[PDB]
Write a protein that binds this ligand. Structure first.
Ligand code: JL3
Ligand code: JL3
Ligand code: JL3
Ligand code: JL3
Ligand code: Y01
Ligand code: Y01
Ligand code: Y01
Ligand code: Y01
Ligand code: LPE
Ligand code: A1AHJ
Ligand code: NAG
Ligand code: NAG
Ligand code: CA
Length: 1056
């Protein structure tokens, strides 16, 4: 019965049968239970439970009163409750949600999965240290957010009560709301606040009603159906969690900037650094570390000739595009006829030399033969075979040894990843059926729904990639309850920060297992570089003061104009002195013998050319614009002058060499899928834009209805457009929308129809899964190479003294502060007056208790000894700080009111420093932070290279996108009042949003849209430069951040 191993196979068969019965559940067609199919399915489910209820009985009898066995017991008893409770209508359906755990029983039946899970469960205990750091971040930023922005997002511009009452009119809405309704609220700034958005910024009517919305008072709803707000600690953690995932975090920032103050970007910048970067990547560091701790044909010319035949054919395939000329189409087919014939000619020649048996011996020769038959078949059969022509690129593997070796390594990586992938599908399946139970037909239908298994799996996969996952969150919270946020928190936490970091650990472990004399002296002077470095910094200020809105006749323009001439002269003289002392190129140690010296030479050369053009009252405007773009690279001269920056830059370039082959393979995949996408989707990404298009079906009807026929910004018209779309897909920002266009594509001059071709999910999901694999091997390649480099390199006083030295006092304080932590979270918006008194009295008790601790500490150790410890200094600071805050509060109560409420608010917010005491107790957490401290010297320079990259692109963006405008005639999708390149200050802030990858694709869309005909000073070739600006910034910015993750990872390993 149980001894026979085939019994487990019988059990496994039933488990899979129980996975299918769960997958055929229809959310809102089975609840009625009135259909015949449901009736048989329920009987099927009952039969399955009988087996497992029986099987548990035999196992208990044979073995009597294994963690997995406990889980099996829990499923049976929970299911029995549901089955036995039948007949009671009180939350019967709600009890039916427990069956989603049944697929977990498959973990124990598969030995490979069980071992992997057991290893995973053994690493969780070491993640508590990271979990504590999460509590500090969420708790600290959860109160500061609540104390500041409690109830401010309810603000709306209301009509005056006297105005409406006296005039006896009520046709108007009570408060201003755009025609979109509550979906785009207009949050004003109260009179006592200094928010950016005021009730006087209301656009006029388009006699004027909008001018009478001039009262900003609290409304009755927060943004997103009440989902986003800081009214209490519960709602503040939902906002903070969304910021940590970097999805829609700018939207939350703009809400509080519009309501409280523009200087709230400091709060979010620290959160994105402390929590979103370090805290979330320390999870990867800890997991990865812990896992590791547990005759003519053979001629070279003939081979080269065949190589170029394949390569040229591949290039010819990617020259197609929309509205292709007829002659070009004919030429391509003729080219295909020639190339396939040439391959056929090689097919015959090799067969004769080696014979039919000899040819089959070579494995690659087999693949070549399979290609010739289809190529000839296509001609003889004269369109599905056309898409198969892309397999010809695989022939190049024969002649590329570096890539052939690399592909073997990647292919071998699938053996280790196979077990993890099976565990991931189970994780996605369980959460997919759970979502249908909770959000079944509740999203009244949105594309991101749980109405069926197919679209429940796609929505769960989409959430894991963190793309519009907050849009689904708001639907879930509004539809069922605000506590539905736990579904997304658990899905995103167990999935991204636990399971994905386990995949990284698997891969990392697998791979791991007379005048000239004067000049010669001056440049060699110790302070020469420092003197020059001062001038470079002053030249950076001049670059950062440039902006479009400078009046040419103002004194600022002439000041900037003159400063350029001086700096050009200064850097020419510095170059001139150096060349004299070293010689241009003739000498062995000549000036241009080093790349860094050469880099300067180009910069000085361009400056001189700029002067000449400026000297020339001629048609040289186009040239002037280009020189202005190259003049933003001047800050690059800082690297050579700073020894620390020079070393880190040289290290980043070296790190690229080990992963050079992966990048080449990744670049080849982009082209293969880019050409594939063009064939499928070229000419099908057009749509009719109008208020009502339910009757439009073709282009002609769109024109007849007097609407506009417009093309998507990201399309597959040609290989140029396809590569830009694939990069946006790979970046996982805006990748869902591009997928929707592919699904809805119908044909040329045809209106897209929703979910027209669901089979296109394979094209988009496959690209994301494969690319994410390549990008993961790049991270592992850098980690492995770095590790290789590291390896090769009085009686009344005595009683008090006993108490203070004893651990009892420390544990007593830790309890008091814990209570204060709970008390500090009791506050909320519009709390009852009784609570204010109760919380105030609690403050009195804590203040005196802390005061007694200081008094006892002083006597036990003494004034000089007590001040020695840093912890005691921290305690003194807060107690002094706490007394000051309470004193001001009492004066505020008193009749005298000279204290500005701003001071009282700041003191209340700064009272949270009491939590820092627990930092002393958490010995484990402090050690984890100490790992980051030891990595600061390596991480500090990487931060200097991050700010240097920001400066060059921030100044370059202002020159390019400085004058772009947003208006109702030319609406923008990514830019707004908060996101602009108007000045260097705004460009710097916008690039921070882009680096985090939050709606950075919408910003590029704004630069690709054609400028108005009437508008002037529009760059004709801006749409060509925008992809280069955003692609290079994204790749360079992400590489630097990855190397910061590796730097901390190395120190964690070498420390243990
Ligand atoms: C240290 C934390 C780390 C993880 C944080 C991740 C985010 C957690 C979000 C989960 C909490 C969701 C509840 C939020 C909330 O307050 O809303 C619920 C409820 C309003 O919703 P109704 O549908 O009942 O509307 C009623 C309308 N009158 O809010 C309340 O009224 C009070 C609920 C309790 C407030 C929160 C106290 C507990 C702290 C959050 C619980 C989550 C813990 C995470 C482990
Ligand atoms: C592994 C995942 C574990 C977490 C599970 C996540 C899902 C939690 C449950 C979410 C839904 C619970 C409420 C269901 C529901 O429909 O409630 C009805 C009621 C009113 O909402 P109407 O749907 O009628 O409104 C529609 C408007 N026309 O919802 C409530 O407000 C009741 C909330 C009760 C909370 C029960 C669960 C949390 C208990 C605390 C956990 C700590
Ligand atoms: C790489 C080499 C090519 C491998 C992929 C072969 C795809 C063949 C495409 C055939 C085709 O045109 O149909 C695909 C089908 C669309 O059906 P209709 O043509 O009836 O559409 C209406 C015609 N206007 O959709 C798919 O199945 C797309 C699958 C794409 C492959 C993605 C995975 C590649 C690995
Ligand atoms: C100087 C260096 C310039 C060249 C560097 C090329 C290799 C680095 C590729 C980028 C990378 O490794 O970054 C990883 C990044 C982070 O992934 P998340 O999913 O966490 O993104 C969070 C969103 N804010 O991944 C990407 O964003 C992928 C970018 C495209 C990858 C494909 C490019 C490979 C080359 C072709
Ligand atoms: C990248 C390797 C692996 C393959 C080679 C790819 C090329 C064949 C691609 C890259 C850029 C493509 C071009 C990008 C943009 C255009 C403009 C497009 O529209 C026009 O020519 C505009 C006409 C007008 O404005 O009047 C026609 C296709 C064409 C030339 C594309 C033809 C195919 C090109 C040259
Ligand atoms: C180390 C480098 C980056 C130098 C330090 C940076 C500064 C040069 C930046 C930071 C803040 C910037 C300022 C932020 C805000 C403004 C207002 C803004 O004014 C306008 O655009 C016009 C407003 C109006 O006319 O009402 C742009 C210029 C200025 C002074 C910016 C000029 C450049 C500043 C001083
Ligand atoms: C460690 C901490 C997080 C747990 C202990 C703190 C709780 C006792 C606090 C946290 C937030 C408080 C809530 C914040 C806001 C509200 C809403 C308030 O008004 C409403 O119920 C209206 C809600 C609406 O209109 O949406 C009633 C009290 C209540 C539930 C509070 C009750 C007490 C709560 C749950
Ligand atoms: C291989 C992966 C890592 C991507 C690498 C970057 C590409 C996404 C970039 C490199 C060059 C870019 C192209 C450069 C120029 C153009 C022409 C541009 O159209 C015009 O120039 C017409 C308007 C005008 O005349 O200015 C459309 C985008 C496109 C194809 C760009 C699309 C995005 C491309 C392919
Ligand atoms: C990572 C490290 C941080 C990166 C991002 C840092 C960004 C810092 C610069 C943040 C922005 O700095 C410039 C601001 O002064 C705004 O200048 P504006 O001219 O737009 O407005 C001036 C008037 N108000 C709006 C201030 C009242
Ligand atoms: C660059 C690195 C240092 C390696 C970290 C990058 N990662 C961080 C981030 C997550 C987003 N989520 C997914 O990619 C995803 C997709 C599926 Cl199907 C299942 C699961 Cl569990 C997760 C990525 C990639
Ligand atoms: C036309 C109109 O609405 N005027 C009102 C005025 O009556 C009111 O005193 C003031 C402050 O609320 O705001 C404005
Ligand atoms: C439901 C609906 O709008 N049907 C209209 C129909 O009345 C009209 O005759 C036709 C041609 O314009 O287009 C469609
Ligand atoms: Ca996004």
């Amino acid at each position: 019965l149980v001894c026979n191993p085939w019994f487990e196979h019988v059990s496994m068969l039933v488990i899979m049968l129980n996975c299918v019965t769960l997958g055929m559940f229809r959310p809102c067609e089975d609840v009625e239970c009135g259909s015949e199919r449901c009736n048989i399915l329920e009987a099927f489910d009952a039969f399955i439970f009988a087996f497992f209820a029986v099987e548990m009985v035999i196992k208990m009898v044979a073995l009597g009163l294994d963690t997995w066995n406990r889980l099996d017991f829990f499923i049976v008893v929970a299911g029995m409750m549901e089955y036995s409770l039948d007949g009671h209508n009180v939350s019967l359906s709600a009890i039916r949600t427990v069956r989603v755990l049944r697929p977990l029983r498959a973990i124990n039946r598969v030995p490979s999965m069980r071992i992997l899970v057991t290893l995973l469960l053994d690493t969780l205990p070491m993640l508590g240290n990271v979990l504590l750091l999460c509590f500090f971040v969420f708790f600290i930023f959860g109160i500061v957010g609540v104390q500041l922005w409690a109830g401010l997002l309810r603000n709306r511009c209301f009509l005056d009560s006297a105005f409406v009452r006296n005039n006896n009119l009520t046709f108007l809405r009570p408060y201003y709301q755009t025609e979109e309704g509550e979906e785009n609220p207009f949050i004003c700034s109260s009179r006592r606040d200094n928010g950016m958005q005021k009730c006087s910024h209301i656009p006029g009517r388009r006699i004027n009603w909008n001018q009478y919305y001039n009262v900003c008072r609290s409304g009755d709803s927060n943004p997103h159906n009440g989902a986003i707000n800081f009214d209490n600690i519960g709602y503040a953690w939902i906002a903070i969690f969304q910021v940590i995932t970097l999805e829609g975090w700018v939207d939350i920032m703009y809400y509080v900037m519009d309501a409280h103050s523009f200087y709230n970007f400091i709060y979010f910048i620290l959160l994105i650094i402390v929590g979103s970067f370090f805290m979330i990547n320390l999870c990867l560091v800890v997991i990865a570390t812990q896992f590791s701790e547990t005759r003519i044909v053979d001629s070279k010319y003939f081979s080269r000739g065949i190589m170029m035949a394949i390569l040229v054919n591949t290039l010819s395939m990617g020259v197609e595009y929309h509205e292709q000329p007829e002659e070009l189409t004919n030429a391509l087919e003729i080219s295909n006829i020639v190339f396939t014939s040439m391959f056929a000619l090689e097919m015959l020649l090799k067969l004769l030399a080696c014979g039919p048996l000899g040819y089959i011996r070579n494995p690659y020769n087999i693949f070549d033969g399979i290609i010739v038959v289809i190529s000839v078949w296509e001609i003889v059969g004269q369109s599905v075979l056309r898409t198969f022509r892309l397999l010809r690129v695989l022939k190049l593997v024969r002649f590329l040894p570096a890539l052939r070796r690399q592909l073997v390594v990647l292919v071998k990586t699938m053996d280790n990843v196979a077990t993890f992938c099976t565990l991931l599908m189970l994780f996605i399946f369980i959460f997919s059926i759970l979502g249908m139970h909770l959000f079944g037909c509740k999203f009244s239908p949105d594309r991101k729904n749980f109405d069926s298994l197919l679209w429940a799996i796609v929505t769960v996969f989409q959430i894991l990639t963190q793309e519009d996952w907050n849009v689904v969150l708001y639907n879930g919270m509004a539809s069922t309850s605000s506590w539905a946020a736990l579904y997304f928190v658990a899905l995103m936490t167990f999935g991204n920060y636990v399971l994905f970091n386990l995949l990284v650990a698997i891969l990392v472990e697998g791979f791991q297992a007379r005048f000239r004399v004067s000049c010669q002296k001056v440049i060699t002077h110790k302070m020469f570089d420092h003197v020059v470095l001062v001038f470079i910094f002053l030249n950076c200020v001049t670059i950062a003061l440039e902006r479009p809105d400078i009046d040419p006749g103002s004194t600022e323009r002439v000041f900037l104009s003159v400063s350029n001439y001086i700096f050009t002269a200064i850097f020419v003289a510095e170059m001139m002195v150096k060349v004299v002392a070293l010689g241009l190129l003739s000498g062995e140690h000549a000036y241009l013998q080093s790349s860094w010296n050469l880099l300067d030479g180009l910069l000085v050369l361009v400056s001189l050319v700029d002067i000449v053009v400026a000297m020339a009252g001629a048609k040289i405007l186009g040239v002037l614009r280009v020189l202005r773009l190259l003049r933003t690279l001047r800050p690059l001269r800082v690297i050579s002058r700073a020894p620390g920056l020079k070393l880190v830059v040289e290290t980043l370039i070296s790190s690229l060499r080990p992963i050079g082959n992966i990048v080449l393979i990744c670049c080849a995949f982009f082209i293969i899928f880019g050409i594939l996408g063009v064939q499928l989707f070229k000419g099908k990404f057009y749509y009719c834009e109008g208020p009502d298009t339910r009757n439009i079906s073709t282009k002609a009807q769109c024109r007849a209805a007097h609407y506009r026929w417009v093309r998507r910004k990201y399309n597959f018209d040609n290989l140029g457009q396809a590569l830009m779309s694939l990069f946006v897909l790979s970046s996982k920002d805006g990748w869902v929308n591009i997928m929707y266009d592919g699904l809805d594509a119908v044909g040329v001059d045809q209106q897209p129809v929703q979910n027209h071709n669901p089979w296109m999910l394979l094209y988009f999901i496959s690209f994301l899964l494969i690319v994410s694999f390549f990008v993961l091997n790049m991270f592992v390649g850098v980690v492995v190479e770095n590790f290789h480099k590291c390896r090769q390199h009085s009686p009344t006083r005595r009683s008090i003294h006993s108490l203070c030295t004893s651990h009892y006092l420390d544990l007593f304080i830790t309890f008091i502060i814990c209570v204060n932590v709970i008390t500090m979270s009791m506050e909320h918006y519009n709390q009852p007056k009784s609570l204010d008194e109760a919380l105030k009295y609690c403050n009195y008790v804590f203040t005196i208790v802390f005061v007694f601790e200081a008094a006892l500490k002083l006597v036990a150790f003494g004034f000089r000894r007590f001040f020695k410890d840093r912890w005691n200094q921290l305690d003194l600071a807060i107690v002094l700080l706490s007394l000051m805050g309470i004193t001001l509060e009492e004066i505020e109560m008193s009749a005298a009111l000279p204290i500005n409420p701003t001071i009282i608010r700041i003191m209340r917010v700064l009272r949270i420093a009491r939590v820092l005491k627990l930092l002393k107790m958490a010995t484990g957490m402090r050690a984890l932070l100490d790992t980051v401290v030891q990595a600061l010297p390596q991480v500090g320079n990487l931060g200097l290279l991050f700010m240097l990259l920001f400066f060059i692109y921030a100044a370059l963006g202002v020159e390019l996108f400085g004058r772009l405008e947003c208006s109702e005639d030319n609406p923008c999708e990514g830019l707004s009042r908060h996101a602009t390149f108007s000045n260097f200050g705004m460009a710097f802030l916008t690039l921070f949003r882009v680096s985090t990858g939050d709606n950075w694709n919408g910003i590029m869309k704004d630069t690709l849209r054609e400028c108005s005909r009437e508008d002037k000073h529009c760059l004709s070739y801006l749409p060509a430069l925008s992809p280069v600006y955003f692609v290079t910034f994204v790749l360079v910015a992400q590489f630097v951040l990855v190397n910061v993750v590796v730097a901390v990872l190395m120190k964690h390993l070498e420390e243990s």
